């Protein structure tokens, strides 16, 4: 993990995320959407659990992206919760929650749920 | 449970659901939306687990409602997963998933997640 997590990750749609996993459990980086234009880039911050077990378990982690940058304000945020699996074909499998700010009458439609798998390729 | 589940349940918004929990784990009934007009009523079908434990555990259950009736076709379905707790103040606590049929490009926004608590009052 840590060293293994640092790098570029891609999901089944093309989104790319670049992270630096620091010594003490911090995750910092950027997420970029499809197209890959200068700034479809947003800041991501998360944490990972830095002393994972030794039975081949995955490394639990999660991160958040607020969909606001200098070109777009989507008034929403996504959190990804999952684990990193290293090896020949390392991957991070996640489940995510995307919440949009709504009025109290529309709060029922405020959170979408999905899953993403990221690979180094 | 079973006898305890059968009856009318209301959630924090006013929705009402009426179920009959049958001897062999079946749940059948109707769900009605706010307003409570003749047919804001949809059919619900589910299952509950009929021989629950004796340490005060809740009774696991779930049901589905397809949002189509003779007045409306919302092209969606909701599933509620949770447990029934009996007693002075019995309640069913659930987490739900509402999926809308989308095209493959919009599948990412197809499922909303939320929670509901139902009481007899």
């Amino acid at each position: 993990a840590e060293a293994g997590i640092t790098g570029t990750w891609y999901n089944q749609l093309g989104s790319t995320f670049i992270v630096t996993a620091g010594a003490d459990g911090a995750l910092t980086g950027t997420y970029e959407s499809a197209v890959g234009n200068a700034e479809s880039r947003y800041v991501l911050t998360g944490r990972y659990d830095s002393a994972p077990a030794t039975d081949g378990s995955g490394t639990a982690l999660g991160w958040t992206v607020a969909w606001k940058n200098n070109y777009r304000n989507a008034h929403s945020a996504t959190t990804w919760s999952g684990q990193y699996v290293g090896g020949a074909e390392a991957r991070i499998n996640t489940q995510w929650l995307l919440t949009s700010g709504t009025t109290e009458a529309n709060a029922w439609k405020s959170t979408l749920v999905g899953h993403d798998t990221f690979t180094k390729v | 449970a079973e006898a305890g589940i059968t009856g009318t349940w209301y959630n924090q918004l006013g929705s009402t659901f009426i179920v009959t929990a049958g001897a062999d784990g079946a749940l059948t009934g109707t769900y009605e939306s706010a307003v409570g007009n003749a047919e804001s009523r949809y059919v619900l079908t589910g299952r509950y687990d009929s021989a629950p434990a004796t340490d005060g555990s809740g009774t696991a259950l779930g049901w589905t409602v397809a949002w189509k009736n003779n007045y409306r076709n919302a092209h969606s379905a909701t599933t509620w997963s949770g447990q029934y707790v009996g007693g002075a103040e019995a309640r069913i606590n659930t987490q739900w998933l509402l999926t809308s049929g989308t095209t493959e490009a919009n599948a990412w926004k197809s499922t909303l997640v939320g929670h509901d608590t139902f009481t007899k009052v």
Partner: peptide
Amino acid sequence: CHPQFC
């Protein structure tokens, strides 16, 4: 479409 995607 949403930035998470496009």
